[PDB]
Design an enzyme around this catalytic site. Structure first.
Site, short mmCIF file in Angstrom:
data_model
loop_
_atom_site.label_atom_id
_atom_site.label_comp_id
_atom_site.label_asym_id
_atom_site.label_seq_id
_atom_site.Cartn_x
_atom_site.Cartn_y
_atom_site.Cartn_z
CG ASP A 1 -1.92 -1.00 1.36
OD1 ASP A 1 -1.87 -2.02 0.63
OD2 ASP A 1 -2.85 -0.89 2.18
CB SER B 1 -2.71 2.33 4.30
OG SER B 1 -2.13 1.11 3.90
CG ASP C 1 -6.87 1.95 4.64
OD1 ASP C 1 -5.98 1.59 5.44
OD2 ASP C 1 -7.25 1.12 3.78
CD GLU D 1 -8.83 -3.47 2.66
OE1 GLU D 1 -8.34 -3.94 1.61
OE2 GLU D 1 -8.39 -3.73 3.79
#
Ligand SMILES: [Ca+2]
EC number: 2.4.1.10
Length: 440
Positions: free
Chosen positions: A53, A131, A214, A309
């Site tokens: 990522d 992330s 995220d 995500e």
């Protein structure tokens, strides 16, 4: 339970829309293009690490930032032999360069001691760095947002920020350290699920999938926001048996609800659907990047999946576009298979909604390669450009830990055309591995 209908004032990824995707995804307009495996390289500066990522340093509107003549990309990286080894590294290139070989490695953003020096109770229990996003502030600072993951505490995930102090010269960037390193948000129970609610259910062995990660920074009219992956809480349509009787999650009509709900209740996906309450959440931040306001989710995916995500949102040519990645293997929709991986997308006239599906269904990208395929990609992410009708799709290529000589790396980027409420992959638009902009 009796049927009811409650939207909670938010948008929904509905079963009816998702059911249209298996046929629709046969159209090349919505497909990740085939990549040429003999062009693919490991990131040379990563020295054998898997690199998955990744996200560019962005200006407030999502366009790619220029830090003292460099592009900067943050990425998750770690030892291919250890699936729990995940840290954020900072890569950089001179602006104008495009080769994967142009990406130098400034190393880890954080020292192991940083989480302790931060005087932050949640941070000192962190075991992995997951992330997020990074914004380039008006006073010239690198402002990182990421996910503090705690394997010690049943996979707690906390939205976290830090300023990354970086010296620039004609040849290199050097990370000197971090400051203003602090937890921002760990859920509130009512709007977004917290880890205690996951623990209430029996954590991992319950089949529930708790997420709060995220974080993606964006501004509108000088207000600062994070949009992030989450799950709903108790007051905006929680997981449970009763959720399968909410018509808002089905769409189309009462006839469709009756047919689809009875099928779902009779299926081996009943429990998965009851547990499924994914959401793209939103909070407003203060000017020092602390929490100002917990806001209602932009969209939720009750019954469909627990896992949406890489939340992403930006304004482009007068409209707002909201994206998320999701695995078919974790969905409950007939015709969607364990091979299917998607970027889904939605459009609004306003940052805060309401959002309606792109291409009628929400489908933007489909990737269905075998996990063993060296050109398998994941974590697709649309990078806005300063002008034009194209965005650049980045992703990582090659599954973590699969091949001794071929690590997770930057995928070849490609172009996605966006106009109104429609998108299309641009024919033969494959760029260099990890290329962030069309301009050079
Ligand atoms: Ca759930």
């Amino acid at each position: 339970q009796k049927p009811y209908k409650e939207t909670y004032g938010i948008s929904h990824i509905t079963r009816h829309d998702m059911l249209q995707i298996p046929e629709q995804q046969k159209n090349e307009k919505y497909q990740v293009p085939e990549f040429d495996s003999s062009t693919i390289k490991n990131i040379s500066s990563a020295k054998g690490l898997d690199v998955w990522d990744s996200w560019p340093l962005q200006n407030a509107d999502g366009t790619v930032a220029n830090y003292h003549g460099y592009h900067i990309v943050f990425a998750l990286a770690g030892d291919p032999k250890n699936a729990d080894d995940t840290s954020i590294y900072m890569f950089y290139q001179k602006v104008g360069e495009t080769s994967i070989d142009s990406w130098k490695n400034a190393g880890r953003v954080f020292k192991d001691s940083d989480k302790f020096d931060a005087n932050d109770s949640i941070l000192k229990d962190q075991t992995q760095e997951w992330s997020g996003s990074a914004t380039f502030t008006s006073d010239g600072k690198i402002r990182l947002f990421y996910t503090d993951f705690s394997g010690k505490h049943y996979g707690k995930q906390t939205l976290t920020t830090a300023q990354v102090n970086v010296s620039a010269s004609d040849s290199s960037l050097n990370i000197n350290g971090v400051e203003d390193y602090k937890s921002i948000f760990d859920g509130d129970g009512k709007t977004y699920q917290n880890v205690q609610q996951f623990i209430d259910e029996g954590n991992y062995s319950s089949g529930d999938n708790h997420t709060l990660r995220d974080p993606h920074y964006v501004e509108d009219k000088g207000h600062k926001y994070l949009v992030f992956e989450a799950n709903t809480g108790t007051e905006d349509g929680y997981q449970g048996e009763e959720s399968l009787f909410n018509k808002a999650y089905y769409g189309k009509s009462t006839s469709f609800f009756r047919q689809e709900s009875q099928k779902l209740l009779q299926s081996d996906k009943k429990r998965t659907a009851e547990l499924a309450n994914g959401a793209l959440g939103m909070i407003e931040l203060n000017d020092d990047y602390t929490l100002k306001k917990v806001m209602k989710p932009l969209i939720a995916s009750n019954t469909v999946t627990d896992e949406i995500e890489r939340a992403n949102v930006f304004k482009m040519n007068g409209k707002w576009y909201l994206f998320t990645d999701s695995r078919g293997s974790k969905m409950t929709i007939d015709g969607i298979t364990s091979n299917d991986i998607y970027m889904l997308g939605y459009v609004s006239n306003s940052l805060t909604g309401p959002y309606k599906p792109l291409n009628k269904t929400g489908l933007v990208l489909k990737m269905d390669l075998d996990p063993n395929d060296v050109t398998f990609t994941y974590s697709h992410f649309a990078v806005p450009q300063a002008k034009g009708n194209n965005v650049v799709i980045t992703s990582y290529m090659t599954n973590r830990g699969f091949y001794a000589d071929k690590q997770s790396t930057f995928a070849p980027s490609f172009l996605l055309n966006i106009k109104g409420k429609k998108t299309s992959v641009v024919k033969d638009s494959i760029l260099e591995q990890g290329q962030l902009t069309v301009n050079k």
